[PDB]
Protein: RAC-beta serine/threonine kinase
Amino acid sequence: VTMNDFDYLKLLGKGTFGKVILVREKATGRYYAMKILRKEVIVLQNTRHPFLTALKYAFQTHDRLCFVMEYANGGELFFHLSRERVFTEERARFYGAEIVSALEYLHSRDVVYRDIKLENLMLDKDGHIKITDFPEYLAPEVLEDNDYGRAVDWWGLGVVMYEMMCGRLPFYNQDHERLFELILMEEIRFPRTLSPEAKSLLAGLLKKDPKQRLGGGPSDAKEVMEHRFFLSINWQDVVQKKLLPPFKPQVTSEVDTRYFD
Structure:
């Protein structure tokens, strides 16, 4: 595989060590996201899961590292939360359930995702969540001890479920400057409308002390899975993609270039 097999479309993102572009395989007409890393500026391989974007191809040039990955067709979950403003606790339960499924798989392989954040969640054609590897609300132990334990994924989950159900970040009402002290020393507050089970989920997922945090115990995801908030979930079902997505993206196929804009 080489650069000559793809047609450029648009730029998707640009980090320090490289960039990501939306491309289209020429012999297949299918859409992809190519991650190009500046060799000098400086995994993904075998970990496969329904809610994680898979790696299609991987080739190097003379001075670049390229990663051609599957790119979902729904919009970005951020786009969808904007419009709706806020999701129903059931709609969030769905997403949070798919993510928890993926986080269990990764953690059972000794992998900490590190990037469970709204900007990383997309929807596929049928409306299922897709975790992509494309104010930053870093976890407290990351801000204090630069500690990237598995616990940080649950914290990422918590910030996402909070925004999805509250319609806003935990400290949207307090200047970015003081984000560092807040996360570290400010208790998080929840809306009144929120259900008793919902507040409980967020309270446990957003606990500053990683050992206290939900998911932070030795049995990892079991704590999260068996939380009252997730009583209606069929774990073996989500992983099979048996649940009906609570929202259908509105795309004809996986080439309906729509949502790319």
In short: Strands lie at 6-15, 18-25, 31-38, 55-60, 64-70, 121-123, 129-131. DSSP finds eight helices and seven strands in the chain.
